[PDB]
Amino acid sequence: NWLGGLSRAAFPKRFVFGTVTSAYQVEGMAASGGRGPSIWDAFAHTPGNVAGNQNGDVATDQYHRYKEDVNLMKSLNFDAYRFSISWSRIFPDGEGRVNQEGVAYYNNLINYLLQKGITPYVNLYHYDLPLALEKKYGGWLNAKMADLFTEYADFCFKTFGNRVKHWFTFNEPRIVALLGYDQGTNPPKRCTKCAAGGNSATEPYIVAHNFLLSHAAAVARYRTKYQAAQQGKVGIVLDFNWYEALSNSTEDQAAAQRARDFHIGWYLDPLINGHYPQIMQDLVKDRLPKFTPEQARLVKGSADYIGINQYTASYMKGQQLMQQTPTSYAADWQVTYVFAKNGKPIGPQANSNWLYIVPWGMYGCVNYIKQKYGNPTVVITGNGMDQPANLSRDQYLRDTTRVHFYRSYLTQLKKAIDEGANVAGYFAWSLLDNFEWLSGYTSKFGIVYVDFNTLERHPKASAYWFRDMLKH
C-alpha cells in the first residue's frame, strides 16, 4: 500500500504530527508591519548572495494568508505547527521599543491555530538576528547575547505563554556556526579569508558557546518566572545527519564517532551531561571555551525535549590523528567524507547536493541518541526533501519521490520508536515551498506547492499522503 502500513495506530498514543516553517522563509512583509531588518534582510538584498538575487521580502506572504495555510494544515489532519517568531518583527532594534503590530500578528496566528485545534510549537529564533544587534554588539560573538536573548524570550513568554506551551529557543546553531563563522557563506559572512573579518578556527566555537549560554539563560528565566503559572516546556532544535563508518576498521569507526561528536555532541553533551565531548576538548583545546561549574550546571538539563532536524547520512573514512595547525571547525574533525561503499552510492540525491536520500539514517540518528544520551525526549522537528526549479505545476504536484521519502523515513523512525526510543513527535519540513536561504526559490521542500508568481497554494501528492496517513 502507498501508506506502507503507516497510520496513527502505528505510532505511540498522543504522538504529535505537524509541519514546519520559519519566519523569514514564509512570512513576507519583511519591511512592513513595523518589522525591523534582520541580518538575512541585508544579506539577501546584496547582489550575488542568493540564487537569482531573490530575497524574503514577500516569500509565501503567509503574513496575509495565514488563515488559508492553517485551514490547509487542518484539512491534512496535522495536530501541530512549528513556526518561528521573528525577533525584529517584535523588537525592530532587537531591544527597547516593542512593535505592537508585530505582536498582534503572532497573537492572531496563535489564536487561529488554537481555534482550529492545531498546537503551536514556537521557535524564538531561526537565523534572523536583528540587524541592529549585529551592528551594535557583534551578534553571537558577544557573550552579552545571553542577556539580550533572555529579555526577548521573557517578553515572548509573558505575551504568548498563556497560550503557547511548547517553545524552542534556537534552530540549528551548528549551521549558524559553520556557515556564518567557519565558511562565511551565510550572514554575517565571517571566516579567516573574509571581507567582513573573522577566524574559522576560533569563532564557530565562540558562537556555539554563546548559543548554549543564551539557551540556558532563557530557560532559567522561563523556569524561575513563568513555568509555575504557564506549565509549558522549552527545548532547542539541533541538526543531526547520520555518520556511518565506511568499514569496520578501528580508524573508520573512530572517524564516524568523531563526526557524531563534532556534529551533535557539540550541543548534546553540554545539554545532557554538562560538558563538551571529550574528543572536542582533546582536539580543539584552548580554542574551545570552558564552562564554569555554575554555567555547566545551568546548561545541563536545560532542554525539556531535544528537537532533531534529520535529513541525510554519509560514510566516514578515518585517518591517523595528527598534530595540526588549527584552520577551521570543519578541519578539526580529522575525517574524510565518502558517499559510496562497495561501489554503490549511499543513496540518490534530492535537489540539494548535500541531501542524500538515506532513510536508515533516521534510524541511525534516533537510535544513537537513545543509546548514548539516556533516551531523552526527542521531537523530530524537521525532515523532508526538495524538488528543483523550473518544473511545471503538475510536475511539482506529482511528487512521487517525496511520497517515497516520507514513507521510508517514517518507517525507519517507527522502527526506532518500536525499539524504545523516546520520540514524542514528528514535523515535516516544509508545509510550503518557501525561501530556501542561498537557494532562494530554486529549491522546493513543501508538501504544498506555492506558485511564486500568483502565490496560490496547491497540495502535492505528499500532502494527500499525509492526510490519508493521519486521519483520526
Ligand X SMILES: OC[C@H]1O[C@@H](O[C@H]2[C@H](O)[C@@H](O)[C@H](O[C@H]3[C@H](O)[C@@H](O)[C@H](O[C@H]4[C@H](O)[C@@H](O)[C@H](O)O[C@@H]4CO)O[C@@H]3CO)O[C@@H]2CO)[C@H](O)[C@@H](O)[C@@H]1O
- Which residues here bind ligand X, judged by CB under 6 A? 1-2, 22, 171-172, 175, 239, 241, 309, 311-312, 330, 337, 354, 382, 429, 436-437, 445, 461, 464, 468
Applying the rule CB under 5 A, the residues between 49 and 108 that interact with Zn ion are: 61, 64
The option from Zn ion, ligand X, none interacting with 239 (CB < 5 to 8 A, set by class) reads ligand X
CB of 10 or CB of 175, closer to ligand X: 175
Q: How far is the CB of 442 from ligand X (least distance, A)?
A: 12
- Within 300-392, residue ranges assigned H as helices are 329-332, 360-372
Contact 461, 398 (CB under 8 A): yes
CB of 137 or CB of 266, closer to ligand X: 266
The option from Zn ion, ligand X, none interacting with 339 (CB < 5 to 8 A, set by class) reads none
CB of 97 or CB of 393, closer to ligand X: 393
Strands 340-341 and 313-317: unpaired
The option from Zn ion, ligand X, none interacting with 95 (CB < 5 to 8 A, set by class) reads none
Strands 233-239 and 166-171: parallel
CB of 155 or CB of 464, closer to ligand X: 464
Nearest position to ligand X, beta carbon: 1
Q: How far is the CB of 226 from ligand X (least distance, A)?
A: 26
CB of 99 or CB of 171, closer to ligand X: 171
Q: How far is the CB of 457 from ligand X (least distance, A)?
A: 14
Q: What is the DSSP letter of 182?
A: I
CA distance 146 to 212: 9
The option from Zn ion, ligand X, none interacting with 61 (CB < 5 to 8 A, set by class) reads Zn ion
Q: Enter the C-alpha cell of residue 404.
A: 517515497
CA distances from 194 to 150, 209, 389 (A): 30, 22, 30
CB of 175 or CB of 220, closer to ligand X: 175
CA distance 67 to 105: 12
Contact 262, 205 (CB under 8 A): no
Residue 207: alpha-carbon gap to chain centroid: 16
Q: How far is the CB of 436 from ligand X (least distance, A)?
A: 5
Q: What angle do CA 377, 303, 374 make, to 5 degrees?
A: 45
Q: Is 28 left (phi over 0), alpha (psi -120 to 50) or beta?
A: left
Q: How far is the CB of 311 from ligand X (least distance, A)?
A: 5
Q: What angle do CA 96, 100, 105 make, to 5 degrees?
A: 125
The option from ligand X, Zn ion, none interacting with 464 (CB < 5 to 8 A, set by class) reads ligand X
Applying CB under 5 A, which residues contact Zn ion?
61, 64
